[PDB]
Amino acid sequence: DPVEDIIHRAISSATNVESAANTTPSSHRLETGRVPALQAA
Amino acid sequence: SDRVAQLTVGNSSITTQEAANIVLAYGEWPEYCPDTDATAVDKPTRPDVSVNRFYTLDSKMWQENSTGWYWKFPDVLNKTGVFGQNAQFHYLYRSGFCLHVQCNASKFHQGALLVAVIPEFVIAGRGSNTKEAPHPGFTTTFPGTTGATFYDPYVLDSGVPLSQALIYPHQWINLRTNNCATVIVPYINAVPFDSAINHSNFGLIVIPVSPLKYSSGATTAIPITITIAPLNSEFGGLRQAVS
């Protein structure tokens, strides 16, 4: 009923880390479309 | 049921009919490196047939005035077989071993050998200098398949007496009782993987304590052959060949 337009977060997330990170076992990739080596700096 | 044994590893097998027993070094079996003790982040190779088999070295003639012998492991197998090619292409290395020293003699011969396994067996120099100083050559420290004869077996060429060297894993080859000694050794090192070219873990040693004696007319040539075999061997860090 009065003037209307008078009426009108982050990214990071900290984690408690005790020791260094582990490593999970991997396999071989033979497929197209999914590439982790190409970056854009 | 105790003097007769057969040891089949890979595509090779050793029989014996006059054995004594089989010694596990420090009560443990050679195994692969667990995930809670590994420090590399690559996947290791495990050939498991092509590298786990009995390799037979050359024979050493045992005489009246022998002062004894020593090999370095895994130095003697860096140039023989597919174990010698996996230990050159790969930076890292881990294995156990299974040793077997054959020496037969008749019922009219006498003598005894001491077949022991010495972890981290460091050769000493032989000079009275307090700094320059004498140090052993590379063919004396890392001899290869031809071994090396001791100069002073009473102190094991390291200033450490033979009379206490039964604290290591060992057997005896007494020519009236047996003809072969078998020692099974796990991987003993302060790091999980280590290089197979710079660092030899332990050294097999055969020293005749009581000398070979025989009456006239008997067979004068008594050889000593050594047949060794890697067990649970795995490599890592692939690159080009370095010998």
Side-chain angles (χ1 to χ4, degrees), chain B residues 57 71-80 143-147 228:
Chain B
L57 299 175
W71 289 263
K72 293 292 190 291
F73 293 154
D75 193 12
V76 305
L77 298 177
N78 290 320
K79 293 181 181 179
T80 63
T145 62
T146 65
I228 67 172

Side-chain angles (χ1 to χ4, degrees), chain B residues 12 16 19 31 33 44 53 62 67 73 82 87 97 102 105 124 139 156 159-160 164 177 192 202 217 219 230:
Chain B
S12 64
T16 180
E31 67 182 2
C33 183
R53 62 180 297 276
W62 175 35
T67 61
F73 293 154
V82 189
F97 285 96
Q102 306 94 15
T139 60
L156 294 173
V160 165
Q164 299 175 0
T177 293
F202 57 91
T219 301

Side-chain angles (χ1 to χ4, degrees), chain B residues 49-185:
Chain B
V49 173
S50 178
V51 292
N52 291 320
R53 62 180 297 276
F54 282 103
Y55 295 99
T56 299
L57 299 175
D58 292 330
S59 69
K60 296 293 182 181
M61 291 295 172
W62 175 35
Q63 296 180 356
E64 296 289 326
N65 289 320
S66 292
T67 61
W69 301 283
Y70 63 96
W71 289 263
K72 293 292 190 291
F73 293 154
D75 193 12
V76 305
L77 298 177
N78 290 320
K79 293 181 181 179
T80 63
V82 189
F83 184 80
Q85 299 298 110
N86 285 313
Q88 292 178 358
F89 288 144
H90 293 90
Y91 172 65
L92 295 174
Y93 165 73
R94 180 180 177 90
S95 73
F97 285 96
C98 178
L99 312 180
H100 196 72
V101 177
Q102 306 94 15
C103 178
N104 55 0
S106 179
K107 303 290 182 67
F108 288 166
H109 293 82
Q110 67 183 1
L113 295 172
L114 174 59
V115 179
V117 169
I118 296 182
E120 299 291 330
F121 178 63
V122 179
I123 299 296
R126 296 176 68 201
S128 67
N129 290 316
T130 319
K131 289 188 286 186
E132 188 71 28
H135 295 93
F138 180 72
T139 60
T140 304
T141 60
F142 283 92
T145 62
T146 65
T149 59
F150 286 98
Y151 296 106
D152 297 330
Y154 181 70
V155 296
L156 294 173
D157 289 336
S158 63
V160 165
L162 188 146
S163 65
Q164 299 175 0
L166 304 181
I167 191 65
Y168 296 116
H170 69 283
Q171 288 192 359
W172 291 89
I173 300 172
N174 193 1
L175 294 178
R176 63 171 290 157
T177 293
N178 55 359
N179 55 2
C180 62
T182 303
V183 179
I184 298 171
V185 182

Side-chain angles (χ1 to χ4, degrees), chain A residues 5-37:
Chain A
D5 56 356
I6 304 171
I7 300 169
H8 295 173
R9 62 185 179 179
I11 296 170
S12 64
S13 65
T15 59
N16 293 113
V17 176
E18 297 291 328
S19 67
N22 295 321
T23 299
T24 61
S26 178
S27 180
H28 61 88
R29 174 178 293 113
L30 294 171
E31 63 184 359
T32 60
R34 292 181 180 178
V35 49

